[PDB]
Structure formats: C-alpha cells, structure tokens
Amino acid sequence: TAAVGADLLGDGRPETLWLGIGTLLMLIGTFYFIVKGWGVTDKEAREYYSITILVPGIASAAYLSMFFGIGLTEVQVGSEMLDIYYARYADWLFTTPLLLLDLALLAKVDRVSIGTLVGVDALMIVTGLVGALSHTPLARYTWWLFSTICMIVVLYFLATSLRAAAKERGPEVASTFNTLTALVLVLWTAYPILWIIGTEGAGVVGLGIETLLFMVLDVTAKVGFGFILLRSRAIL
C-alpha cells in the first residue's frame, strides 16, 4: 500500500509525478516534431506532419490539466468515491482519430472508410468515458465491454482492410504501415486491460502505477508512433 510517484504539488495525489513527466515528454516530442517540421516541402509529408503533430500536442494539453488537477472528479459508486480523470478521454477523443488518420491516409482509403474508422474509434473513447462514469458496477463492466468491442472492430479494420491497401502500395509503405500497425495492435489493446484492473475497474492496481503505466503507453503510442512514422519514406 505504498504509492509510487510523488506529490509534487502537495494536492494529496502522488501521481502528479508521473503526470508531470508525461507533460514534459509530450511537449518535447511535440516540439521535436515541429522542429523537423521546418525542413519539409512535400505536400504529402507536410500533411502527415500536420496530423501527427497535433497528437503529441493535444496530449500535452491534456497532461498539463491533469497535473494541475483540472480534469479530475469523483464518481460515487457503491460506497467508495473513485477518482476519475476525464481529461484523458478528451485527450483520447481526438488523439486516436488523428493517430488513426495517419494510417488511413497512409493506406489511402475512401472518405467513407476513414469516416467509419473515426466514427467507431470515437464511439470507443466516448463509451469508455461513459464507463468511467457509470454508477452501477455491472454498467461499468458493460460499457467497458462495448467500448472494447469497438476497440477490436477498429483494430480489426487496421489489420485487414487497411493492411491490404497499404500492401497494395509499395513495400516501403507496407513495411512502415504494418510496423506502426503492429505497435498500435499492442499498446492500444493494453489500455482496456489496465483500465479494467485499475481504479476505474477492479482497483487491484493503485492510481500511481496506473497513471505511470498509462503515461508510458501514451508517450509510446503517440511520440513513438510518430517517430516511426515521420521517419519512414512512406510519408513521401
């Protein structure tokens, strides 16, 4: 029962340590992307960079809030009061669609397809938020399911339909596509897991470890994703 992290602010919450580091990393990656932004000319590249840069950015915005306890609230469930960081879902509400877009634009698919990926992938983040806020223990597990269903559907498409369009294109796009797709096919899945066992679910894991882990996932899912992306020749 010894929490991991530090109470930098003194707000009781020891996760601010991890929440803090996440902000720094998000910012840096963000800047770092902008820095490599002043060096491109291609209209395809200046398009990937566009999307891919808002991600680590919006993240930074979300992580700053949580650090200062902006996106925080309580949710009376059963008898306890679960600390719920909503900023996360807002962060995710946008950072996934975009992160997803990169693959889509990388696979070159119709607007009706992309308009489907994002419709689902949005349904996920929102339902998930609903979960987080559900007052009935069954409900939370329920939403947590639907949400996960979605996540799978989204992860489905990425590996089939999309994996194919990027395969049709040159193996330089494919390689890059599949790689970034592998990464998501991993980090991403880990979320609902960590969610269901963390303070939003079982409570088997303390908020400190969770927020930490979450940040590690986040940074990798975002900055790392881009670093692999903006480095590929596929962006060209």
Give whichever of 37 and 224 is closer to ligand RET, judged by the CB atom: 224
For residues 4 and 16, is the Cβ–Cβ distance under 8 A? no
- Return the C-alpha torsion angle 181, 187, 189, 195, nearest 10: -160
Distance between CA 72 and CA 68 in Å, rounded?
A: 9
- Is 201 an interacting residue with respect to a copy of itself (CB under 8 A)? no
- Is 172 an interacting residue with respect to a copy of itself (CB under 8 A)? no
Binding mask 94-133 for a copy of itself (x = CB under 8 A): ----------------------------------------
| Nearest residue to ligand RET on Cβ basis | 128
Give whichever of 13 and 222 is closer to ligand RET, judged by the CB atom: 222
CA 189-194-197 angle, 5° bins:
135
Distance between CA 100 and CA 60 in Å, rounded?
A: 18
Q: How far apart are the first and last CA of the chain?
A: 51
- The interface region with ligand RET, picked from 25-33, 124-132, 175-183, 204-212 by CB under 6 A, is 124-132
What DSSP element (H or E) covers 54?
helix 45-67
- The interface region with ligand RET, picked from 28-36, 65-73, 93-101, 174-182 by CB under 6 A, is 93-101
Binding mask 158-187 for ligand RET (x = CB under 6 A): ------------------------------
Tokens 């998930």 belong to 128
Applying CB under 8 A, which residues contact a copy of itself?
1-7, 10, 14, 74, 76, 79-83, 199, 203-204, 206-208
